[PDB]
Design a protein around this ligand. Structure first.
Ligand SMILES: Nc1nc2c(ncn2[C@@H]2O[C@H](COP(=O)(O)OP(=O)(O)NP(=O)(O)O)[C@@H](O)[C@H]2O)c(=O)[nH]1
Ligand SMILES: [Mg+2]
Lengths: 73, 167
């Protein structure tokens, strides 16, 4: 019922969040584990390229449901 | 250069749609069963001499997300209908998925492949005859796969691409 969309280079993933006060760090780790093999990766919001979303910040603090899985530099 | 084929994996929850997709994409099996909502993967593969890019869509087996079904069944070119050989009713749910595809696509002629997953399991509820006879009724190939041993995984996706080559 509560999911975020992670846009990657070779597809996208809908990641369900149990509660809306999750880290941006926990979301990133689940994103890399599903998109790629395991475990140099950052989240940016799709609307604004190169935001480098704060990993401490929660989803309530975020004003978006869509983020991009992009590699560092 | 590359022909693009858009594949959709449909079936009841827990039949192994994610396990089959993950096996062909990143080449390993996992027993976590992290339930799916929707995931897309693009992989470059060689099929019988033809280099092609595969657009794989992993759907949710839980009818709670059935709303998205009306939207993705209109996008893909072929459908990989998966049931569990140890789950009778997921095999029964195959008929529902086909009929929904046929009338979202508004076409009887839709490229598809029947997949019976989890070959490695010792106890079986659905015999090969039941799926084979159902396959001829639908006029589509039936492939038995095991995501845990990777048996039939490529075979099933490859046959779907071959079926999509209907003119
Ligand atoms: N022994 C065995 N277990 C399998 C096989 N394929 C999948 N499983 C197991 O079956 C369970 C469900 O697999 P999964 O791919 O997540 O199923 P799904 O069809 O994607 N489920 P959902 O639609 O709800 O997301 C997992 O525990 C997985 O390890 C297989 O070939 N053999
Ligand atoms: Mg799944």
């Amino acid at each position: 019922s509560l999911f975020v969309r992670i846009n990657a280079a070779h597809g996208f993933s809908l990641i369900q969040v149990d509660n809306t006060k999750v880290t941006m760090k926990e979301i990133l780790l689940k994103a890399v584990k599903r998109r790629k093999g395991s475990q140099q990766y950052r989240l940016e919001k799709q609307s604004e390229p190169n935001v480098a979303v704060d990993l401490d910040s929660t989803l309530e603090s975020q004003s978006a449901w869509e983020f991009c899985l992009v590699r560092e530099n | 250069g590359m022909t693009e084929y858009k594949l959709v994996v449909v079936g009841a929850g827990g039949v192994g749609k994610s396990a089959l997709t993950i096996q062909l994409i990143q080449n390993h099996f996992v027993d976590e069963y992290d339930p799916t909502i929707e995931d897309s993967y693009r992989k470059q593969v060689v099929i019988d001499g033809e280099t092609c890019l595969l657009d794989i869509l992993d759907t949710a087996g839980r009818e709670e997300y059935s709303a998205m079904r009306d939207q993705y069944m209109r996008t893909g070119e072929g459908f990989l209908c998966v049931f569990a050989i140890n789950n009778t009713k997921s095999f029964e749910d195959i008929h529902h998925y086909r009929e929904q595809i046929k009338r979202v696509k508004d076409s009887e002629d839709v490229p598809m492949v029947l997949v019976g997953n989890k070959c490695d399991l010792p106890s079986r509820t659905v015999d090969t005859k039941q799926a084979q006879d159902l396959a001829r009724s639908y006029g589509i190939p039936f492939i038995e796969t095991s995501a845990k041993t990777r048996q039939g995984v490529d075979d099933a996706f490859y046959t779907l691409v071959r079926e999509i080559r209907k003119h």
